[PDB]
Design a protein around this ligand. Structure first.
Ligand SMILES: *Cc1c(COP(=O)(O)O)cnc(C)c1O
Ligand SMILES: *Cc1c(COP(=O)(O)O)cnc(C)c1O
Lengths: 288, 319
């Protein structure tokens, strides 16, 4: 695991890509936010598939293996067009698990490149109500139906990212503890968006144990509280993060940065507040 | 710099993206190569612009600042469609240097996305002899002419990646020392492709000082082996960022043992195998490096227990 590791990445040898997961830098965005207070963020784009999903992917596979639910060399299946696919693909490659992915033909082919490159068997499922570039709820229901049919036929382990509790456990045992150590306990708030919610629930649960006075915010597009963010704000702060800090990240990172700056300006926090967010993935994982 | 750093990235705070450069993991590819001997590789794709060019970019900017040649807040310009552009873009963003890039309209628009996202001012220059998707030497010469014209007006610092000796210095002072420490001195051979030649010349020079018995190999595309002295029959290959038809101007034959040739088909095969066996999606030059290192392990030219070290140059996502 990333918790018990004796691995020295700086001055030693890294046994495998699994040891590249977690213990990510916590960077100061001191140029983007020169004060008062400090904006810091976990560089989750420096995980081996360039997203925070390496953590949840690693936990969900590793814990299925430990439980006996997933046997050596046996098949894994997930429904995804996103970062979770790349993460599971990387973990299953190292651990020697055949991995099948279902996703809608609706997705840009670009969404399968990394998964396929890391040895995923990518099944493209016909759209039911959507058109190229628009994957609908019925398009997703169909991808799900294809994966369930394959799972019943093969008895592959279904990762079930949205309902697997080892998703949040990853962040409770790695992300949160790392932030607590890296800040030496100096942190007034944490904030991140929710897809599965693993990152927010796991990290916030751990931080509130160390210090219940830490304000944890969900970033909501268009638990202490929520901060709302527009697509225009996401785009603006994605660009500013690049221009000021030299980090090309995705749109959810734009949103997190824009929410964190609103939170620093609000006066809800002490004048000298240290605010921590997540740089979720690389900007390279997006077309155009 | 990356040499004097007290920064603790694991258990402390990373001041800026500059401190994300170098001290990259040296990974054991023990599944791709289960023995005998060992394949090791620097994860240069975990630099902040996902290429080894963060090192050479950082050195060329930092050393121009130290020399006085580049003043605070003054302009930088480079002719580039490549990983070097992203690296300079990242370094100049942190240090607050306006950065202008020239490149041929011939290049895919995709080649400008990262540079532009990190605040690079991208000037697209009309092709002279090439067509969309085919950038010729005359197309590149034109981009150069546009950058020199702009440089006359603005007096920007010209990075000059193919002629800047601080390119090699980067790898002499970081890459080589890291490999030497991370292996605790156990390395029988080093190998990497050559574009500018910084990585090979710098790393090899340092390793041969620690141990002159370390064999250092250049990875060359089949039919494009200038450094080996062989005639060029195939100018076009898939090893993007390396395998230029000329012996690089920064090349130093005194840290060179031999060349290992690789086909396009081998680059592709080992790019895929690196992904399927190790979970690392890297670029074409990484495919080539892995295929040359495996060929070198299988050859029997080295001891059966040999430790061979190469470079995972960039992410597969940059293509
Ligand atoms: C998964 C993901 C999120 C949200 O993470 P969860 O832990 O699933 O809530 C945010 N941004 C990106 C880019 C993601 O891939
Ligand atoms: C630049 C580059 C090389 C060559 O390294 P040099 O130090 O320029 O010789 C190899 N691979 C990739 C992907 C590069 O970008």
């Amino acid at each position: 695991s990333m918790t018990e590791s004796t691995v020295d990445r700086i001055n030693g040898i890294t046994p495998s890509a699994l040891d590249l997961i977690g213990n990510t830098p916590l960077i100061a965005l001191d140029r983007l936010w020169p004060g008062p207070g400090r904006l810091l963020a976990k560089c989750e784009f420096l995980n081996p598939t360039a997203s925070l999903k390496d953590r949840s992917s690693y936990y969900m596979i590793a814990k299925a293996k430990e439980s006996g639910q997933l046997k050596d060399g046996e098949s894994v299946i997930e429904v995804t067009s996103g970062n979770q696919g790349g993460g599971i693909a990387c973990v299953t490659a190292v651990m020697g698990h055949p991995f099948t992915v279902t996703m809608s033909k609706g997705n840009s082919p670009q969404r399968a490149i990394m998964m396929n490159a890391l040895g995923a068997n990518v099944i493209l499922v016909d759209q039911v109500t959507g058109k190229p570039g628009n994957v609908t709820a019925d398009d997703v229901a169909a991808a799900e139906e294809t994966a369930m049919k394959i799972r019943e036929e093969t008895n592959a382990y279904y990762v079930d990212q949205f309902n697997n509790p080892t998703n949040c456990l990853a962040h409770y045992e790695t992300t949160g503890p790392e932030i607590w150590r890296q800040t030496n306990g100096r942190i007034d708030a944490f904030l991140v968006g929710c897809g599965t919610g693993g990152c927010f629930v796991g990290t916030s649960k751990f931080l509130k144990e160390k210090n219940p006075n830490v304000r944890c915010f969900v970033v909501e597009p268009e638990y202490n509280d929520s901060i709302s963010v527009s697509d225009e704000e996401a785009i603006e702060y994605r660009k500013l993060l690049g221009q000021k800090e030299g980090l090309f990240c995705g749109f959810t990172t734009g949103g997190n940065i824009a929410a964190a700056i609103k939170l620093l300006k609000s006066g809800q926090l002490p004048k000298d507040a240290w605010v921590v967010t997540i740089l979720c993935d690389s900007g390279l994982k997006y077309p155009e």
